[PDB]
Amino acid sequence: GPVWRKHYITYRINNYTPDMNREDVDYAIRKAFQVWSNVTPLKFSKINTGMADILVVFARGAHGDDHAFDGKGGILAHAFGPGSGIGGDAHFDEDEFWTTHSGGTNLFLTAVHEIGHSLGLGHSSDPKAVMFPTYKYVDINTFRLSADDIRGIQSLYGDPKENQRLPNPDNSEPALCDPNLSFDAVTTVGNKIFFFKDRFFWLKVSERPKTSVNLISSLWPTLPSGIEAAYEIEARNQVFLFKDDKYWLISNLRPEPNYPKSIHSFGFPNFVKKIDAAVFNPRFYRTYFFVDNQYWRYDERRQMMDPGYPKLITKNFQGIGPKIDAVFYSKNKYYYFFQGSNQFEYDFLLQRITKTLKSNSWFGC
């Protein structure tokens, strides 16, 4: 079918069968989900309030749908492939008797078959599968995915995000996906992107599948670690490294005749102690400087702030927080902003955040 266009996904257990022990269903379920995330790059979260994205429900005969139930047997659950609205809900025929055991009609086994569906999978012609529609009421903590089901879950989603399997996946540090990966500064230099962090820098996007973090003292000479702001000027091979009241010019990875130097000879007041984010716009020939609260634009081709400058980041850039960690230019009319573990696709052409993404996306985790 289609599939879920999100790494992280929600469920809410909507109501409880009185075949009960609430808590046993929390489990049977929480756990059903687990089955899937354990072979699979997803997470699952039981929120208790607001509108979850997978919905478990226990209703009977005619419930809502157009696709009614039928009583004791035959259909026991149906769930809805992904899709807003009622897209991924898993529903359960209350006229059965659900169990932690294998008297009655197991809700571990059915919850899991039917979460797939919710998920994307059709059936498995595969007998051995946690469903050959023909529920194999089997032992319970030892049980596991017929390799088959593993394929089309895997077809649809991967194999999991850094090592070798079933067994499941681990979760690193300094890392490509601690999802609270913030930035010192960041830029691209002609077709790569340098991502700064303390002594670290991770580099690229460019057809190179995957991000290799390294120390900054290896590519870089006359310069400190821990880098606050940066941009580029692709037509002159220049990367500009900013920290504290001083900056560094660069070429071809090589520090042109003189640095560091001051930031003030570039122009600002002495009221200004540090540049926080910076981005150069070739469309129109200007650099954007960001001082917590406010910003400044430098006319590159004249060496001259344009008139009227400091300014107010939010008044002029719609919704970008009053402090910004990193900006950088998209080879075609955007700036991508990095405020916290957050980053914004920002169309500068009609000013509007248009995509909000995980601070760490081009490590397409």
Residues that bind Zn ion (CB under 5 A): 65, 91, 133
DSSP string spanning 230-264?
EEEEGGGTEEEEEETTEEEE-BTTB-TTT-SEESS
Q: Which distant-in-sequence residues (6+ apart) come within 8 Å of 208 by Cβ?
A: none
Q: Let me know: does 42 contact 157? Beta carbons within 8 Å.
A: yes
- The verdict on 276 binding Ca ion (CB under 5 A) reads yes
- The total of other beta-carbon atoms located within 10 Å of residue 323's CB is 14
Long-range CB contact pairs, 214-220, < 8 A, 24+:
219/253, 220/253
Q: List the single partner that 232 binds among Zn ion, Ca ion, none, CB under 5 to 8 Å by kind.
A: none
Q: Does 67 appear as a known binding residue?
A: no
Q: In the bound complex, what is the minimum distance in angstroms from residue 60's beta carbon to Ca ion?
A: 8
- The verdict on 325 binding Ca ion (CB under 5 A) reads yes
- The verdict on 114 binding Ca ion (CB under 5 A) reads no
Q: List the single partner that 91 binds among Ca ion, Zn ion, none, CB under 5 to 8 Å by kind.
A: Zn ion
Q: Which distant-in-sequence residues (6+ apart) come within 8 Å of 155 by Cβ?
A: none
Q: What angle do CA 107, 27, 57 make, to 5 degrees?
A: 55
CA 58 → CA 12, 63, 223, 231, 341, distances in Å? 12, 9, 63, 56, 38
Q: Does 71 appear as a known binding residue?
A: yes
114 is catalytic: yes
Q: Of 149 and 325, which CB lies nearer to Ca ion in the complex structure? A: 325
Q: Of 122 and 322, which CB lies nearer to Zn ion in the complex structure? A: 122
Q: Classify 340 in phi/psi space as left (phi over 0), alpha (psi -120 to 50) or beta.
A: left
Catalytic residue among 23, 114, 300, 345: 114
Of 307, 244, 247, which Cα lies nearest the Cα of 272? 244
- The verdict on 232 binding Ca ion (CB under 5 A) reads no
Q: Does 244 appear as a known binding residue?
A: no
The 11-30 site mask, x for binding Ca ion (CB under 5 A), equals --------x-----------
- The verdict on 93 binding Ca ion (CB under 5 A) reads yes
Q: In the bound complex, what is the minimum distance in angstroms from residue 91's beta carbon to Zn ion?
A: 4
Binding segment toward Ca ion, per CB under 5 A, in 7-15, 41-49, 115-123, 271-279: 271-279
Pairing of strands 193-197, 98-99: unpaired
Q: Does 264 appear as a known binding residue?
A: no
Q: Does 23 appear as a known binding residue?
A: no
Q: Classify 85 in phi/psi space as left (phi over 0), alpha (psi -120 to 50) or beta.
A: left
Q: List the single partner that 65 binds among Zn ion, Ca ion, none, CB under 5 to 8 Å by kind.
A: Zn ion
Of 111, 62, 112, 64, which Cα lies nearest the Cα of 86? 64
Write out the catalytic residue numbers: 114
Which residues contribute to the annotated binding site?
19, 53, 63, 65, 70-71, 73, 75, 78, 85, 87, 89, 91, 93-94, 96, 113, 117, 123, 184, 228, 276, 325
Which residues contribute to the annotated binding site for Ca(2+)?
19, 53, 70-71, 73, 75, 85, 87, 89, 93-94, 96, 184, 228, 276, 325
**Which residues of the chain form contacts with Ca ion (CB under 5 A)?**
19, 70-71, 88, 93-94, 228, 276, 325
